[PDB]
Amino acid sequence: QDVQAFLKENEEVIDQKMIEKSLNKLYEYIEQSKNCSYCGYHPKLVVNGRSIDIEYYECKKQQSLMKSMYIQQDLLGATFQQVDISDPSRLAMFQHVTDFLKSYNETGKGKGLYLYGKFGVGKTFMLAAIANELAEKEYSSMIVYVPEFVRELKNSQTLEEKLNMVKTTPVLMLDDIGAESWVRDEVIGTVLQHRMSQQLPTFFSSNFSPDELKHHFTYSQEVKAARLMERILYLAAPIRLDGENRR
């Protein structure tokens, strides 16, 4: 059953033979089992090339499908109600969460979201609006601070067991990207290339308008400079967030 869902998701990529090749994976995927326990990840299918693989994504009863490390969870006061349909921001921000809340779990083809604009508006009050009421639709989601992970993999013995769980689970919400030769392309720039044959969404939040984010990764003299920013313009839907000073 899981295979069916994933297939429709990646049916453009997967072939009949791919199904029979990744049979073991898709069959192991099903088995009903909703997940693990504790005492931390869940298996998801992710087609690599011509083969379908199985990657693990990391796992008063709502915020439990909504855990977080490196940031906080007191901030999770950022929900659907008091935050109103206000600007080109929220004239289209809750919709591209709720039109999607009717097509949740892994079946049909998919995207994420992107968050930008200018000062005072929001990038951390709208990634907490595709979250807690998603602890109502059998599939959990994520809230993690991307920039809070960019100061410990320079200074960090098995660290090749950590990055195969925080990228191939049902949801990705890669936070703020726009400040300060970049490992960003191994740390944050290779959080996309398995979300192709495994079909996995990429929501983002940021600092610059849709003609500006392809120029924050290294300077010299490009043929290679915007690899990610094409893959970070497809698996999502970006909108104009600009309202009152709610920061």
Tokens of 38: 């504790």
* 122 annotated to bind ligand: yes
C-beta closer to a copy of itself: residue 45 or 232: 232
Rounded Cα distance, 210 and 119, in Å: 16
Rounded Cα distance, 233 and 81, in Å: 29
Where the chain is discontinuous (C–N > 2.5 Å), the residues before each break are 39, 59, 156, 180, 221
Rounded Cα distance, 21 and 29, in Å: 14
Rounded Cα distance, 216 and 207, in Å: 11
Closest contact distance (angstroms) between CB of 58 and a copy of itself is 19
> Which residue from 132, 197, 205, 206 is in contact with a copy of itself, where contact means CB under 8 A?
197
Tokens of 123: 């990038």
- 75 near a copy of itself, rule: CB under 8 A: yes
> Which residue from 80, 227, 237, 242 is in contact with a copy of itself, where contact means CB under 8 A?
227
**Location of structure tokens 């003299």:** 221
Looking only at residues 134 through 153 of this chain, which bind a copy of itself when binding is defined by CB under 8 A?
145, 147-148, 151-152
Binding positions for Zn(2+) are: 36, 39, 42, 59
Return binding residues.
Answer: 36, 39, 42, 59, 117-124
Binding site for a copy of itself (CB under 8 A): 70-72, 75, 105-107, 109, 119-120, 124, 145, 147-148, 151-152, 154-155, 176, 179-180, 193-194, 196-199, 223-224, 226-227, 230-231, 234, 245, 247
